[PDB]
């Protein structure tokens, strides 16, 4: 079934704008939305088919008090995305309240696309955590979607924000988002601003314009995570089959990301596989262990190398994991596209369930716990107090995320057979 992407918030709208542009050039598409003449791939899932080959992405763009939003509209690709479905604070509470009054028109825009498609399998959100308007509005829309569309499976390309710690309420906003995400997301793929900023400092000298350049890094991961779905394959063609292996227990649905070519701008599989297990290529910042690992390689890979390669990574043990889940690394292979350059034709990515990401969740919980005692930034803005007089959703969120922090470490232990 076709996938509908609910890109929301200024930050989320920036990475959806680029992700669709990335699949414009990668696929046989043009800024008008029509196919290029020069142009064997499965464009049905991601791109709606118009009568005159105007393959329009099924993007849902949500904006709130737009000013810099108009920049997406003044672009050569404005015609490419024309489902004609765009509808008009820095606080999590401020975003949640604004979403509630406009919920029905934004929800009808969801319906239109659902009716238009032959079918709808999942809602992929370009979510921004502690995103000012992006968070709060995104949590609320996350709660409505599961109730209305229980059958579908949701994913979140959460850009978890770590900038070395401006938002003084950033921990409070993030704390609330996770309680909803844990509760109302079937899957989440985690990314980190600092981890990518550190990569940007590593591969390039770019430091001050970190957000503009890092957009390309988030994009390469995003296009890559779905390339097996976008291009024809003998296995995991459906999104669901892919999702099951990466998330073995429902609560632990957060996925770590890595790219074998930190710089993609021959190499045998035995090599490309080993790079994913080096921490310099990872993009995320008591014993600790992965729960299950998966990898997808691109290009005309030599296959015999993989049997040697898979048995080879095994002797290397570069990846240390002994979870409750069996955790064999899974090997996938896909075709690099026939439009984009063949430089570094072989290039890989890995998506894995790792207990280390628990540490990133605890750090915002640490900032929040410190901030909660001080009550330095309760906002006490009338919106914040009137929306939350008890201020007990933050405590409800704190116990739910602490259960998550606890569950992760329970995964490390030998007995996750018992309740976690």
């Amino acid at each position: 079934r076709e996938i509908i992407t609910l890109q929301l918030g200024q930050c989320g709208n920036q990475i959806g704008f680029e992700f669709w542009k990335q699949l414009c050039a990668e696929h046989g598409i043009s800024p008008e939305g029509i196919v290029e003449e020069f142009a064997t791939d499965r464009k049905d899932v991601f791109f709606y088919q118009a009568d005159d080959e105007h393959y329009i992405p099924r993007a849902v763009l949500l904006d709130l008090e737009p000013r810099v939003i108009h920049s997406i509209l003044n672009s050569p690709y404005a015609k490419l995305y024309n489902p004609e479905n765009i509808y008009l604070g820095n606080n999590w509470a401020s975003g949640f309240s604004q979403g509630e009054k406009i919920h029905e028109d934004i929800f009808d825009i969801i319906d239109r696309e659902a009716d238009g498609s032959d079918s709808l399998e999942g809602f992929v959100l370009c979510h921004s955590i502690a995103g000012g308007t992006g968070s709060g509005l995104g949590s609320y829309l996350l709660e409505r979607l599961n109730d209305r569309y229980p059958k579908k499976l949701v994913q979140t390309y959460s850009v978890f924000p770590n900038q070395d710690e401006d938002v003084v309420v950033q921990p409070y906003n993030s704390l609330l988002t996770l309680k909803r995400l844990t509760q109302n997301a079937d899957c989440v793929v985690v990314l980190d601003n600092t981890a990518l900023n550190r990569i940007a400092t590593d591969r390039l000298h770019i430091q001050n314009p970190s957000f503009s350049q890092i957009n390309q890094l988030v994009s390469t991961i995003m296009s890559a995570s779905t390339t097996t779905l976008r291009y024809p394959g003998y296995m995991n063609n459906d999104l669901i089959g892919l999702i099951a292996s990466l998330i073995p227990t429902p609560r632990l649905h957060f996925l770590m990301t890595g790219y074998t070519p930190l710089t993609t701008d021959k190499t045998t599989v035995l090599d490309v596989m080993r790079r994913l297990l080096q921490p310099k290529n990872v993009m995320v910042s008591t014993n600790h262990c992965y729960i299950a690992i998966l990898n997808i390689i691109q290009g005309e890979v030599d296959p015999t190398q993989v049997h040697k390669s898979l048995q080879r990574i095994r002797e290397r043990k570069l990846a240390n994991f002994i979870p409750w889940g069996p955790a064999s690394i899974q090997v996938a292979l896909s075709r690099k596209s026939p439009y984009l350059p063949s430089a570094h034709r072989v290039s890989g990515l890995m998506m894995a369930n790792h207990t280390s990401i628990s540490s990133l969740f605890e750090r915002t919980c640490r900032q929040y716990d410190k901030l909660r005692k001080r009550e330095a930034f309760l906002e006490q803005f009338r919106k914040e107090d009137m929306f939350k007089d008890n201020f007990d959703e933050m405590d409800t969120s704190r116990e739910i995320v602490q259960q998550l922090i606890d569950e992760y470490h329970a995964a490390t232990r030998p007995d996750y057979i018992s309740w976690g």
């Binding site: 499965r42 049905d44 024809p232 063609n237």
Partner: protein, 96 residues
């Protein structure tokens, strides 16, 4: 996934006494599967047939179709009839 999918809903659901072996349903699903594949509609798609060999008395518990004799049959042109021997395509069926 599709040719197997429609059949599975029916096989598990009921019609278990070879009511899923109606030549009409078999042909209907096959054409449906071929059309909906999206890899393509081609002169090559011709010679594709959905068929059966051993006849099931009834489908068993768990609807296993553990040896269900549904034979995909492929016709071959005179010259390549020599190149592709009947025994050879007999083997091809096994993986299916």
């Amino acid at each position: 996934q599709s040719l197997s999918d429609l059949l599975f809903e029916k096989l598990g659901a009921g019609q278990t006494p070879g009511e899923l072996l109606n030549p009409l349903v078999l042909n209907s699903v096959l054409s449906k599967a071929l059309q909906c594949s999206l890899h393509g509609d081609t002169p090559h798609a011709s010679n594709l047939s959905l068929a059966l060999k051993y006849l099931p008395e009834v489908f068993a518990p768990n609807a296993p179709d553990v040896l269900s004799c549904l034979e995909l049959r492929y016709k071959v042109d005179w010259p390549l009839n020599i190149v592709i021997t009947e025994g050879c395509v007999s083997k091809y069926s096994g993986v299916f």
